[PDB]
Amino acid sequence: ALTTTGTEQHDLFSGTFWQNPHPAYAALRAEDPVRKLALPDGPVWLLTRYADVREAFVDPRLSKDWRHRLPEDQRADMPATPTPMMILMDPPDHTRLRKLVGRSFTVRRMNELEPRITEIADGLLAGLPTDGPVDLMREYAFQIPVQVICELLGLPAEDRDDFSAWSSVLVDDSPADDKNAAMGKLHGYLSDLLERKRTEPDDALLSSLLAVSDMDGDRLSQEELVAMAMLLLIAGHETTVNLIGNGVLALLTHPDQRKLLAEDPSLISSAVEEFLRFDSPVSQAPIRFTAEDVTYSGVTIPAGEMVMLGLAAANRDADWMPEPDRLDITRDASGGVFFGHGIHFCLGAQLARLEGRVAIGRLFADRPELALAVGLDELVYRRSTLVRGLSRMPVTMGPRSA
């Protein structure tokens, strides 16, 4: 397996890394900040220093076009993406699609969801038992964002078990064959769903976008439309859930910070920025491809290579954040690469922040005796190069606040 070089040897993307990657990240930052990882599916580079990561995000030599892996001899015949999602594109197609969908994630729009998000969270909390076993992931942290995304897009509730399964395979260490099958089922499901929406539209996002596409197919093609729906669905299942989980765990493991939040519940939005920094839910940005040689921290990555920007790593870089290993919900947050940076900056950043503060804020308000029901060392994490996420979180809710 892989380990960090230098003065300290820590497992990388195997072994102890899944439980707690943060020591490994620190050893990478200190001693190997531009690291080639000889992973099973092929080598991937990893940048972990904050200044390198932040600038890389605006370096066009680090492209989303996967054809850069190929010699020029082979790029001509090949599609620009495996699925035409904007996160897998460079400008101009990225610019067009982002501008288009960005129109539905305007500042007033997401906030007008607060009342419903709160009702969803409050309903979930009222349904949780006082001391029987609760997996806080499946029963709360997962449920809030999935319900919100289903309502925002107009996804049938009856189909949730099917598409939640396809979604999870795409984001973890599942075999390439399995991922290809999952994407196929999701593409088919959403294609069929859009066909049905044409005949009976609703007021939710997928109908609105289908209408745009119907009116002007050069602004949004049918295939782009399905790929957008797929991207938004998967983001709705696999991101915010781990802000909730990781943030809850941070409070559970830091009584001092939990006490500060209990004493000033209004710290919750500052607290959310701090959870995003301290245990970033998107651990490595999805892959970029070197379109030419690039040099970071004295290390040249050749053209044609795959590159992850290490967000969890960079957000604990002491060169950027003093005492980066300290959880401090009172920090006046600024910078931070947990939502990315530049043209692909998280489309859902406002929505995730709102979901996060509602879910975590209301949970601790409703159940101020919440506690883990296992030791910290018994917690199981997902194996993924994309997400830092608990597989389950055994808790005891304790009594509802009076």
Ligand code: HEM
């Ligand atoms: C919950 C915490 C979330 C985190 C930590 C997060 C993280 C990120 C990051 C790091 C990127 C940039 C990736 C890169 O440049 O390679 C990104 C982009 C993106 N995110 Fe989020 N995300 C979250 C929630 C969401 C939600 C709720 C949505 C639903 C709308 C969403 C939709 C998107 C989309 C569509 C992009 C692609 C944007 C573009 O290419 O222009 N995200 N996210």
Ligand SMILES: C=C1CC[C@H](O)C/C1=C\C=C1/CCC[C@]2(C)[C@@H]([C@H](C)CCCC(C)(C)O)CC[C@@H]12
């Ligand atoms: C969770 C997050 C974190 C970052 C954003 O919020 C959006 C998001 C997920 C959805 C993603 C992540 C980037 C690339 C993904 C994983 C796509 C794959 C590259 C599609 C091709 C899959 C395969 C293996 C069939 O060839 C499918 C859904 C996309």
Ligand SMILES: [Ca+2]
């Ligand atoms: Ca119940």
Ligand SMILES: [Ca+2]
């Ligand atoms: Ca309508």
Ligand SMILES: [Ca+2]
């Ligand atoms: Ca500095």
